Design a binder for this molecule. Structure first.
Ligand SMILES: Nc1ncnc2c1ncn2[C@@H]1O[C@H](CSCC[C@H](N)C(=O)O)[C@@H](O)[C@H]1O
Ligand SMILES: NC[C@H](O)c1ccc(O)cc1
Length: 258
């Protein structure tokens, strides 16, 4: 909470969504891997509905590129005002917005529906109805009278939980807190850092709870999820850059037992 007060959105984006990690040309990169996971999951047609909430969006939109064409009402969220402002600069196409075109383009490449990236970015901007404050540590993450339609048909969260919890236990409770926003039989698409303990965002150094695949699986189960899919990406040497000590990245497709 206090450590995140020095969090620099532009530095975070630069560290993880600009070359080399942000160079989507090589199919073995972490970016193409994450977009592939999201695309294939939605391509199954099993994850559908009207509303969807993205937990701890930070200043990024890539995690919703394949999702947007499946839900008409999308809520983006984040603990920091600076992030929500950054998200606004892109949704409004204001000056200085981050350029996600490489991710939009590759998402279109992977979905293989012959869509142009401008049409995809346009659908996302159109379907994002609101960017709200959020605290996964509160039993009621989005407050009491939130504008977001609850319960959501689906949830998506990337690099949030493990990046905001001191240990596994806090991680477990955080998952429980956001799981309350999801309707029974709903879907959760969780992406996160494997065995990572810190990552930089400008002047801020954030602590991370190093989690493993089994620990992530057991936690989803303990929260009442049937794990539909759970994949791991080992961070290659070329993408280890000193902005963190991440070892891998996991993707989980879990359905709320209900
Ligand atoms: N208590 C809390 N509850 C929810 N989000 C929190 C939080 N404390 C910090 N955060 C936010 O969690 C984010 C982690 S960075 C993740 C950004 C994006 N989802 C991606 O895929 O890269 C930051 O934007 C930070 O402000
Ligand atoms: N906390 C996010 C974590 O540092 C991270 C984010 C994105 C990556 O590609 C790799 C690692």
């Amino acid at each position: 909470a206090s450590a995140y007060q020095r969090f620099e959105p532009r530095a975070y984006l630069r560290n993880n969504y600009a070359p080399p990690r942000g160079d989507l040309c090589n199919p073995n990169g972490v970016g193409p891997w994450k977009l592939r996971c999201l695309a294939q999951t939605f391509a199954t047609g099993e994850v559908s509905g009207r509303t969807l909430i993205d937990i701890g969006s930070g200043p990024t939109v890539y995690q919703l590129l394949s999702a947007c064409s499946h839900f008409e009402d999308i809520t983006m969220t984040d603990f920091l005002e600076v992030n929500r402002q950054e998200l606004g600069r892109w949704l409004q196409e204001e000056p200085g917005a981050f350029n996600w075109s490489m991710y939009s383009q590759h998402a279109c490449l992977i979905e293989g529906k012959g869509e142009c990236w401008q049409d995809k970015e346009r659908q996302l901007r159109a379907r994002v109805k609101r960017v709200l404050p959020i605290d996964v540590h509160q039993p009621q993450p989005l407050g009491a009278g939130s504008p977001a339609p609850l319960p959501a048909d689906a949830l998506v969260s990337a690099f949030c939980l493990e990046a905001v919890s001191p240990d596994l236990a806090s991680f477990q409770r955080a998952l429980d807190h956001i799981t309350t926003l999801l309707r029974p039989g709903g879907h959760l698409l969780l992406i996160g850092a494997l065995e990572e303990s810190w990552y930089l965002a400008g002047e801020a150094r954030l602590t991370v709870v190093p989690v493993s695949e089994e620990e992530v699986r057991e936690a989803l189960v303990r929260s009442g999820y049937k794990v539909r899919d759970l994949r791991t990406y080992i961070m290659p040497a070329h993408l280890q850059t000193g902005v963190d000590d991440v070892k891998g990245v996991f993707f989980a497709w879990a359905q709320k037992v209900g």
